[PDB]
Amino acid sequence: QSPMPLTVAAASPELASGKVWIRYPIVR
Amino acid sequence: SKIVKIIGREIIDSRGNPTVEAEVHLEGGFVGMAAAPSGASTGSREALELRDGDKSRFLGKGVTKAVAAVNGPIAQALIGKDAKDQAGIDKIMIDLDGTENKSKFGANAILAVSLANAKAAAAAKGMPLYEHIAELNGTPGKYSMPVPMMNIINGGEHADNNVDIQEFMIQPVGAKTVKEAIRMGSEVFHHLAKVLKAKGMNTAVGDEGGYAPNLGSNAEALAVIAEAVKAAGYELGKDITLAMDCAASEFYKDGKYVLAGEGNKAFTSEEFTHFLEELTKQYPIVSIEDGLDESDWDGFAYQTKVLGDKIQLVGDDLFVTNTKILKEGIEKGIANSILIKFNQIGSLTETLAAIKMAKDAGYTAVISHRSGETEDATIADLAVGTAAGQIKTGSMSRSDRVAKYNQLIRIEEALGEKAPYNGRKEIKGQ
Amino acid sequence: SKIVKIIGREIIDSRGNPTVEAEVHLEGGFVGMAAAPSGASTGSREALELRDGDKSRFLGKGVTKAVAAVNGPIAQALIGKDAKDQAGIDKIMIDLDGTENKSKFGANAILAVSLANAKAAAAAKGMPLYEHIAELNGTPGKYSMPVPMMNIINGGEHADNNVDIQEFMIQPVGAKTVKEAIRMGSEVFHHLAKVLKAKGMNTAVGDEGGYAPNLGSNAEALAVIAEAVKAAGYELGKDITLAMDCAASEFYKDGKYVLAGEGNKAFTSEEFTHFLEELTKQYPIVSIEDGLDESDWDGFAYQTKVLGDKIQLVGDDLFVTNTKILKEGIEKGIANSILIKFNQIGSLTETLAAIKMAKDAGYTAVISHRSGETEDATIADLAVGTAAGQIKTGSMSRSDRVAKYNQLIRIEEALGEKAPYNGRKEIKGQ
Ligand SMILES: [Mg+2]
């Protein structure tokens, strides 16, 4: 599962456009 | 949703000048990223951005100090804090900066982090930023698609022609959705180039993506627009209305107003407003921004009297997004509208407060770009999520402007009639 | 990583014309979004974008048909497929379209999806797009930061001046990082504005964000650039070299090259080659694009023999990112470099093949923007992930250009020493 699911790209254009990325391992 | 990491960096704005970008990362991996548009590094009435002044880098316009503020003291004060608590996050930064105008860290440092944080929180809640902003606003599920005033012709200090008025804008009031409003803007913009070309004029663009051709007069400016609108197959007044920004401080000389572009007739506060009045009867100009100098309050009182019931009277320089001036201006009866520039104040919580103050007084809030922008489209989500009703985000060229129109299209696609495009009625006095 | 939804939409490009955006969604909530830049809707040598030709919308430039292809036949074919299998996805779309030039669905529909898919798959693999691109390329973990050639002065068909050269560009070869190279570009850009304003010239910008002032000759263009570089504290040659795009076909007639910026002097192709040679002897011009007409292959063979060992000779109109034309050119000793415009081929897989063909032959691949761009920064990740070594993505203004610069800053921050900025040696002949 994506840590940060988007219903539509508009919910995070930055993450959907690949201008920012999730950092792994995910801090929990 | 606890903050785990915050990364500030120096990127480049739409004019080629440095600005600050911030990423806010949360437990669970949620991330938000935003950038500050260009502001003022000097000035008494607004929040100040922090510039380095190192002449060996970017001609003194480096933002390494503001970036260091984000990475060090700001980040350290926010690690472990709840990103959902926007007011709390904003407060920590404002308190730590410890100055009234955010001049220690810079409004650029604090705003980037404020916005990135709001975005990260929206992600942690599984919702778009506009939805989260409505929730922050205490108005969940209340949206509209803003009516855009689009830059199209530039004069005054924003050009080298004989037009005195700084900018003329078009508003596609007759559209039924923002997607249609964008298409109308685009069509007129292209028809305007054809008209200018046909007169052997220059169609290169300014900072906000509009034209700054060699027009001989204000009246020539209004005439080429009217011509473009008709060429595009729309009717001036019904389909498209006009907005303008006088930037009247520019021709304010020792208590009078001198408009070289027109005989240099040097008007009194009173005569300049009737002059504007004359334009509004001749053209469907329904909105006038900074129609007098920002110190000329007794003159603004007069303008608000003469035009205020019929015409939107926008304070930009007049208010500089400053609730103390706004509050004072409301009680005195000065203007009826306000340009909202979130970098002039420096945090999303304060921005929401300014919008709310306007709204509560029946003033219209116009969400505004800056001359120096980025690809960031936060103001699109802001305009929608506060149902502000109007946006000023550029002409229909340059991606620093058109990214905002694109984000509006995306949002309207998701929301449909949950975010109505209200058209002409959004405009004060219409 | 299974595709579960594909969405297409009509958004607006940096010139105010529609283009296609696609979102690709994968099982687990991974999403990638990309847009096609503007391209050709007619021609016989390149992939064709699909335009609506409906004069009642966007002056005939609507892309509703291309968007419909994305939402309908493309989405239905790709649902359930593995987005990681990039070649597989591209093949499904190319076969479905069934034409040799993507003219049934449009190169704009297919490319938007190809790129959106690659982004989605990268996200499914927990890596940025540049890293995924290196894996797709068969060169995992091999990166470089590209050396930018940045538009600064426009002439020919891109201006109304007496400069024949379509564009002059600077390359910050003396920089140690792309971040530095971007700062050096910015500084020269701003000093150039100062130089041009002191001359009473216009500093409004063209499509690529550079200047098109009323210069009186080719020599005067070079002179103002030299003055700007100097004013910024840099040395021509040592810190900054020049690249040019002649677009020589624009001044080719009756088998001669005729230059108004040389007082209407006429040159045979051998003579023009020698004109170019002398220019490279007087100015540090190290790259020359389309220095002869595309039809002039005998001429290009000669130009490559004369200049090819010491000068980068870039095919744009010459090759139009067509591997069939490039293969022949390599066989015949035509040029030594190629502009890569991914929307001229229309898929990521085929783009990777074109870059590979070039590199296998010892030609350089220069990743290119288009005149109509968006806020999308895919070409940045493409240049890094293929270690192409050079990029042509505009002047240091307009976010349609500067978004790519910002993305290179982000990537370089993430990779550091893993992605060297190799400077001048990236350029063919240096
Ligand atoms: Mg070219």
Residue numbers in the entry:
A (entry chain E): 1 to 28
B (entry chain B), C (entry chain A): 1 to 430
Paper text:
In the present study, enolase was cocrystallized with a longer region of RNase E that contains 28 residues and encompasses the conserved region of RNase E (residues 823–850). The cysteine at position 832 was substituted by alanine to avoid oxidation of the synthetic microdomain. The complex with the 28-residue RNase E microdomain belongs to space group P212121, with unit-cell parameters a = 103.9, b = 110.2, c = 160.3 Å, compared with P21 for the 15-mer microdomain with pseudo-orthorhombic unit-cell parameters a = 77.1, b = 124.2, c = 96.1 Å, β = 90.6°. The crystal structure reveals two independent complexes in the asymmetric unit and the microdomains overlay well for the two complexes. As found in the structure with the shorter version of the recognition site, a single RNase E microdomain is bound in a canyon in the protomer–protomer groove of the dimeric enolase. As only a single RNase E microdomain is bound to the dimeric enolase, the interaction is asymmetric. In comparison to the earlier structure with the shorter RNase E microdomain, the conserved extension shown here continues to span up and out of the inter-protomer groove. The RNase E residue Cys832 was substituted by alanine and the Cβ atom of this amino acid is nestled into a hydrophobic enclosure. The binding of the RNase E microdomain has little effect on the structure of the enolase dimer. The proximity of the AR2 motif to the free N-terminal end of the enolase-binding microdomain suggests that the AR2 segment could be in a position to make additional contacts with the surface of enolase.
